[PDB]
Structure 1
Amino acid sequence: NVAHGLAWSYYIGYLRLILPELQARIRTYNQHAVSQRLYILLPLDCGVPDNLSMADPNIRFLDKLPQQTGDRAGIKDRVYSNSIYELLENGQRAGTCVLEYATPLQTLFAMSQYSQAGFSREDRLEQAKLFCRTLEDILADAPESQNNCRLIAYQEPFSLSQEVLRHLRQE
């Protein structure tokens, strides 16, 4: 049950901190049109690339949001930065969103390759589902999540841009 602690740390040390300030940062970039929610990609195979634009030709990096800084555990001005992506459909700009992967899923992957971690590669999908399940239960009861965060969990046997656009059109 390693994913339980990673999901609670993903909320306490990130979502609880950036989500209350996400609406003000998006409004600052819009004025001085990006959508209002932070869209988190949760691949249940834990295949998390670092270049999201290289994972889908229809997902294109656009710009960065205004940075969020704060003193965190003795580190002065710890930077919390997020990227804005454009989603294409038949060569048409179909949406603009703050998009990123669920980083602890990447840690879950590399943890399975370290023999000292005691985490078999077979349990990767099991813990990925537990991570999404735990995070869903936290955000459903979290006051910081006020229609400003959307979890996008999927299982690739496929268009990643189409999956993001379906959640984008629900708003």
Structure 2
Amino acid sequence: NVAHGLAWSYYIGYLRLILPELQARIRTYNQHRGAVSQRLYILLPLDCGVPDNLSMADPNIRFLDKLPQQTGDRAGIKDRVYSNSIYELLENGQRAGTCVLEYATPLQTLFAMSQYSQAGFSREDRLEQAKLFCRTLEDILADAPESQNNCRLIAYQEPADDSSFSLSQEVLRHLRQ
């Protein structure tokens, strides 16, 4: 299935390469008002909507700073640059958590494939494939050596057509545990 390959490729081509150096980069930031959490938090919206600006998805998610960059030679790209962003999570006007946060970009591919006739991916299959992506990635990371309390997947389905939804509260549930 499409989602199976995408989950494996996201581990192999991205997470396996950034997760081993992540806690070092975070420790460095914290040492040079509240330490940044030690894990990469990955947003997995099951509606596969991936905005590029996180603060427009919820005003209580506020960009704070960039992590120091990681670079490595990758596939002929000399000093390929991996950048990641740190966010503050607010709750009733209070800073309640700080963490490295981003969306899983493969879900934006599921979204786009579903709109392109030539991709052979029907619009109505997005949700099932997003669920399959989330399950496959969780199963990969549970057994992966580069994941050492390094990463937390935050999967969520914003309520059917309508009701109240808070992305920042979804992240905070995981941060608190």
Shared fold (TM-score greater than 0.5)? yes
Which deviations, in whole Å up to 9, do the C-alpha atoms of 1:98-143 show, x marking residues without a partner? 0100100011101111111000110000100000010011001001
How far apart, in 1, do the equivalents of 2:151 and 2:86 lie? 14
Match of 2:27 in 1: 27
User: In structure 1, the residue corresponding to 2:25 is in which secondary structure?
Assistant: helix
TM-score, normalised via structure 1 length: 0.98
Q: CA deviation at 1:66?
A: 0.6
Which deviations, in whole Å up to 9, do the C-alpha atoms of 1:30-63 show, x marking residues without a partner? 0011000100000001011110011101000000
Match of 1:84 in 2: 86
User: In structure 1, the residue corresponding to 2:99 is in which secondary structure?
Assistant: strand
- Ranges in structure 2 where 5+ consecutive residues have no aligned partner: 160-164
Q: CA deviation at 1:76?
A: 0.6
Q: CA deviation at 1:19?
A: 0.5
How far apart, in 1, do the equivalents of 2:151 and 2:73 lie? 24
How far apart, in 2, do the equivalents of 1:165 and 1:125 lie? 24
Q: CA deviation at 1:156?
A: 0.6
User: In structure 1, the residue corresponding to 2:20 is in which secondary structure?
Assistant: coil
Match of 2:54 in 1: 52
How far apart, in 1, do the equivalents of 2:77 and 2:116 lie? 29
Q: CA deviation at 1:26?
A: 0.1
Q: Which of 92, 95, 106 is matched with 1:93 structurally?
A: 95
Identity score, percent = 100
User: In structure 1, the residue corresponding to 2:134 is in which secondary structure?
Assistant: helix
Match of 2:122 in 1: 120
How far apart, in 2, do the equivalents of 1:111 and 1:69 lie? 30
Q: Which of 138, 163, 168 is matched with 2:175 structurally?
A: 168
User: In structure 1, the residue corresponding to 2:138 is in which secondary structure?
Assistant: helix
User: In structure 2, the residue corresponding to 1:13 is in which secondary structure?
Assistant: helix
Q: CA deviation at 1:146?
A: 0.4
User: In structure 2, the residue corresponding to 1:96 is in which secondary structure?
Assistant: strand
CA RMSD in angstroms comes to 0.5
Q: Which of 108, 111, 115 is matched with 2:110 structurally?
A: 108
Which deviations, in whole Å up to 9, do the C-alpha atoms of 1:62-83 show, x marking residues without a partner? 0000101111111111111100
